[PDB]
Amino acid sequence: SKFGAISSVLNDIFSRLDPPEAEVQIDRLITGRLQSLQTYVTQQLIRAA
Amino acid sequence: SKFGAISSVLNDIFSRLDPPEAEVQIDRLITGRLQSLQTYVTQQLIRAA
Amino acid sequence: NKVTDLICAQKFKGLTVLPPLLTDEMIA
Amino acid sequence: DPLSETKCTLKSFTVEKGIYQTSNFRVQPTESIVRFPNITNLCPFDEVFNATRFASVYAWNRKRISNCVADYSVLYNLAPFFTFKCYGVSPTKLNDLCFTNVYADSFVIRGDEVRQIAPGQTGNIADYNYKLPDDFTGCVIAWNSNKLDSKVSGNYNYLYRLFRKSNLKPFERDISTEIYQAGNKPCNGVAGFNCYFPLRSYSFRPTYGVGHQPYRVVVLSFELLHAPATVCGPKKSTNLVKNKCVNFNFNGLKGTGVLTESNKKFLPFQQFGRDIADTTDAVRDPQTLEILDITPCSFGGVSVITPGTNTSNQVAVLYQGVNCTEVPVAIHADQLT
Amino acid sequence: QCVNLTTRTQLPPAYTNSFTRGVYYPDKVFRSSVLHSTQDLFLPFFSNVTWFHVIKRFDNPVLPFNDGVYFASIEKSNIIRGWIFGTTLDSKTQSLLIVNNATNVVIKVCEFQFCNDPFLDMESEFRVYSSANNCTFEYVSQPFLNFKNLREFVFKNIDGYFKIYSKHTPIDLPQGFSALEPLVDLPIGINITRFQTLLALHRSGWTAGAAAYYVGYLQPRTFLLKYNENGTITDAVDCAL
Ligand SMILES: *[C@@H]1O[C@H](CO)[C@@H](O)[C@H](O)[C@H]1NC(C)=O
Ligand SMILES: *[C@@H]1O[C@H](CO)[C@@H](O)[C@H](O)[C@H]1NC(C)=O
Ligand SMILES: *[C@@H]1O[C@H](CO)[C@@H](O)[C@H](O)[C@H]1NC(C)=O
Ligand SMILES: *[C@@H]1O[C@H](CO)[C@@H](O)[C@H](O)[C@H]1NC(C)=O
Ligand SMILES: *[C@@H]1O[C@H](CO)[C@@H](O)[C@H](O)[C@H]1NC(C)=O
Ligand SMILES: *[C@@H]1O[C@H](CO)[C@@H](O)[C@H](O)[C@H]1NC(C)=O
Numbered sequence: 072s073k074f075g076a077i078s079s080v081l082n083d084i085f086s087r088l089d090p091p092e093a094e095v096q097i098d099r100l101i102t103g104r105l106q107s108l109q110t111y112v113t114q115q116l117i118r119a120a
Numbered sequence: 121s122k123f124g125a126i127s128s129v130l131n132d133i134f135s136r137l138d139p140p141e142a143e144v145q146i147d148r149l150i151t152g153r154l155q156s157l158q159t160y161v162t163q164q165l166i167r168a169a
Numbered sequence: 170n171k172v173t174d175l176i177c178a179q180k181f182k183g184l185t186v187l188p189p190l191l192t193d194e195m196i197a
Numbered sequence: 198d199p200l201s202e203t204k205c206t207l208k209s210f211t212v213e214k215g216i217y218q219t220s221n222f223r224v225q226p227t228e229s230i231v232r233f234p235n236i237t238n239l240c241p242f243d244e245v246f247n248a249t250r251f252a253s254v255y256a257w258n259r260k261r262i263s264n265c266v267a268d269y270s271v272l273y274n275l276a277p278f279f280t281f282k283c284y285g286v287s288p289t290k291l292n293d294l295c296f297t298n299v300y301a302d303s304f305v306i307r308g309d310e311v312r313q314i315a316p317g318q319t320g321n322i323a324d325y326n327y328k329l330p331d332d333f334t335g336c337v338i339a340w341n342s343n344k345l346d347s348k349v350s351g352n353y354n355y356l357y358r359l360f361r362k363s364n365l366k367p368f369e370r371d372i373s374t375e376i377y378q379a380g381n382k383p384c385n386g387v388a389g390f391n392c393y394f395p396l397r398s399y400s401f402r403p404t405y406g407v408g409h410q411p412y413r414v415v416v417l418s419f420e421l422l423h424a425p426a427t428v429c430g431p432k433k434s435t436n437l438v439k440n441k442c443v444n445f446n447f448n449g450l451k452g453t454g455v456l457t458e459s460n461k462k463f464l465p466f467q468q469f470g471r472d473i474a475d476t477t478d479a480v481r482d483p484q485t486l487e488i489l490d491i492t493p494c495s496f497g498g499v500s501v502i503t504p505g506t507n508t509s510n511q512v513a514v515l516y517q518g519v520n521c522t523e524v525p526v527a528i529h530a531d532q533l534t
Numbered sequence: 535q536c537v538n539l540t541t542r543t544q545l546p547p548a549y550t551n552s553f554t555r556g557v558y559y560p561d562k563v564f565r566s567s568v569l570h571s572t573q574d575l576f577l578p579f580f581s582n583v584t585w586f587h588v589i590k591r592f593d594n595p596v597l598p599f600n601d602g603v604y605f606a607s608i609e610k611s612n613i614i615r616g617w618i619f620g621t622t623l624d625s626k627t628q629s630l631l632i633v634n635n636a637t638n639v640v641i642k643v644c645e646f647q648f649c650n651d652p653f654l655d656m657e658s659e660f661r662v663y664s665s666a667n668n669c670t671f672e673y674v675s676q677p678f679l680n681f682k683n684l685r686e687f688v689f690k691n692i693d694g695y696f697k698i699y700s701k702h703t704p705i706d707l708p709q710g711f712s713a714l715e716p717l718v719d720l721p722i723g724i725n726i727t728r729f730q731t732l733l734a735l736h737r738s739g740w741t742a743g744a745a746a747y748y749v750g751y752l753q754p755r756t757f758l759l760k761y762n763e764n765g766t767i768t769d770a771v772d773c774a775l
């Protein structure tokens with residue numbers, strides 16, 4: 072999932088874009104993926120109960 | 121934590137950057153700290169159960 | 170006895186603790 | 198009154214019997230203090246911008262600026278600087294604060310390639326002459342000096358490196374003039390097939406267009422760090438105030454709290470302190486080497502005990518976590534309740 | 535020019551074990567009753583270090599400067615005087631020199647006409663300062679000062695700052711813990727590769743005692759320092775041991 076970025080493959084962001092602008096796009100990917108993991112843990116705790 | 125911001129101090133960011141451009145920095149810290157508060161309450165609700 | 174600054178540091182960030190309504194004397 | 202605050206919080210015009218946690222009280226500051234070093238000597242910005250002739254780009258000049266006052270109103274004295282780009286700080290009157298060390302790098306380049314003095318750029322300048330770190334913090338000042346440097350017949354005073362095996366690390370200066378060999382045959386110090394001289398001259402001419410006029414660039418690098426600050430902005434100090442909820446500005450550290458005497462065993466090299474939460478708890482006075490504690494002003498929670506509004510309009514107020522000797526009694530409009 | 539001590543006899547260096555040494559204060563912040571994790575250049579725990587005995591035995595070699603050096607010397611009668619640093623260790627280009635007087639300390643960074651073995655020494659024949667061409671930074675302040683004295687020094691050259699940490703404790707490396715408080719910081723912004731220590735021999739054809747100094751190298755490692763009350767580092771843990 073791109074989360075609104077140009078591409079999901081993080082190699083493409085580091086190549087096509089400049090390092091000042093890539094970091095902004097990369098920051099979006101981590102923040103989305105951190106939430107996706109965080110949602111999964113919460114679902115697991117509810118099921119485990 | 122910094123959450124991608126230049127600094128983890130609110131006073132430093134406001135005393136160093138113009139209000140035009142300081143918004144894109146404070147937003148990361150406010151949203152990031154809102155996630156930390158929301159996560160804690162969700163875990164607290166599960167434990168109370 | 171078997172079951173048992175950091176508190177002051179937490180209080181300054183907005184984290185506080187409310188005391189229970191029933192004291193230990195009432196529960197005993 | 199407390200009852201109306203309950204109604205405004207519940208978003209209702211009738212309130213049932215119970216206890217409601219309405220808001221939090223806190224003491225407002227009374228005055229403001231500023232503490233800065235007492236030095237009065239100014240920084241040598243004159244020589245950096247008023248140099249007769251600048252250095253080459255491949256061998257740029259580096260200057261150490263320290264133990265002075267850096268007033269930036271001086272820079273509005275010469276011709277308008279057509280480019281004032283800052284990273285990590287805004288130039289519009291937000292440059293009056295304390296830095297630790299200042300590096301001044303000056304060189305001369307062409308106008309079309311002025312956009313190469315920036316983080317994350319490519320080109321002959323970026324990786325062969327002058328590279329900036331990815332986390333750069335400072336300002337770059339570019340102005341036109343076509344009237345002075347450029348000449349009708351071309352001057353060879355300024356040269357730039359064209360051939361180099363590998364990119365330059367940020368803030369690395371290379372003055373090597375060795376022949377750039379790129380073939381099997383040896384170069385023996387002379388040019389030829391795959392043998393190159395890295396140095397080439399601009400040969401500025403006034404008849405050239407906009408993209409070829411020479412431009413003078415001065416790059417300022419700061420370092421905002423916990424270490425004691427040498428260079429600081431032109432700001433006025435204030436007498437020390439203790440045992441009062443006041444604002445404070447200790448060498449750029451802005452905050453609100455109470456300053457009192459401390460028993461901290463500050464070793465001579467240690468400037469300030471921190472608590473477990475990684476926030477400032479103690480500070481050293483810049484003008485008298487005094488150790489002061491920072492404590493936030495009084496705060497707490499307020500609850501309102503109300504019977505039903507259909508019964509009575511009287512309320513009781515519970516200040517949570519207060520010993521009743523520090524319950525705030527001041528009236529002169531200094532309470533956020 | 536100086537005397538070429540041709541009688542110098544080479545012997546293989548010995549290796550000892552530094553148990554828990556080289557822990558210093560990586561920041562100016564004051565902390566107390568906390569456990570803080572720091573990533574910096576440290577001396578790895580239980581790492582063997584070269585041991586150069588002196589006096590006879592005359593071991594004053596040129597040694598590389600691999601990102602930082604931990605230097606120790608457990609001797610009496612203040613046998614050790616100072617150190618010299620640079621990239622080519624000659625008069626061709628820049629070099630840094632530190633010398634302690636009997637009451638003072640002098641630092642000079644410029645081109646010295648280094649001979650094969652610079653040395654120190656009633657007192658006379660002061661050829662020690664043979665020539666200074668053009669020197670930029672100078673610094674003079676209060677002096678740095680079984681056997682009784684033990685001296686530890688950490689030299690690190692990063693970010694244009696040359697940092698020296700030191701400790702003197704009353705007393706084959708002894709047991710215990712001692713953090714090295716920051717002493718002196720000189721901005722030179724220079725690039726350094728090799729180094730060599732200097733000492734003095736008391737002329738009568740001289741009568742000098744024995745000496746022993748150790749050399750160790752820093753590495754990037756993560757340490758868990760324990761700050762007690764009063765802000766003193768009492769323990770440390772090497773996470774990668
Ligand atoms: C700082 O400078 C002021 C001059 O305005 C002087 O009166 C004061 O004594 C100085 N501070 C110290 C500690 O000497
Ligand atoms: C440079 O010299 C000129 C002429 O005297 C004048 O603008 C000023 O003295 C200097 N400018 C700066 C910015 O120092
Ligand atoms: C509250 O104030 C009283 C009166 O000054 C004092 O004796 C007491 O120690 C304070 N604290 C508590 C917890 O009662
Ligand atoms: C002998 O000493 C002189 C000056 O001290 C020096 O120039 C020369 O290189 C030395 N010779 C040897 C073989 O070390
Ligand atoms: C001493 O030096 C190395 C350093 O890595 C150490 O690991 C080893 O045990 C020793 N080696 C020799 C040759 O003594
Ligand atoms: C070092 O300083 C001491 C004390 O001033 C002096 O007696 C001695 O001559 C100095 N050594 C030199 C200048 O080599």
Ligand SMILES: *[C@@H]1O[C@H](CO)[C@@H](O)[C@H](O)[C@H]1NC(C)=O
Nearest residue numbers: 599600601602691725726727
């Ligand atoms: C000094 O520069 C040389 C250049 O070859 C390099 O090898 C060395 O690592 C540098 N010194 C330090 C302490 O990094």
Ligand SMILES: *[C@@H]1O[C@H](CO)[C@@H](O)[C@H](O)[C@H]1NC(C)=O
Nearest residue numbers: 461462762763764765766768
């Ligand atoms: C801290 O310092 C005080 C006075 O300087 C001393 O009484 C106390 O023992 C010290 N704490 C230690 C050494 O742990």
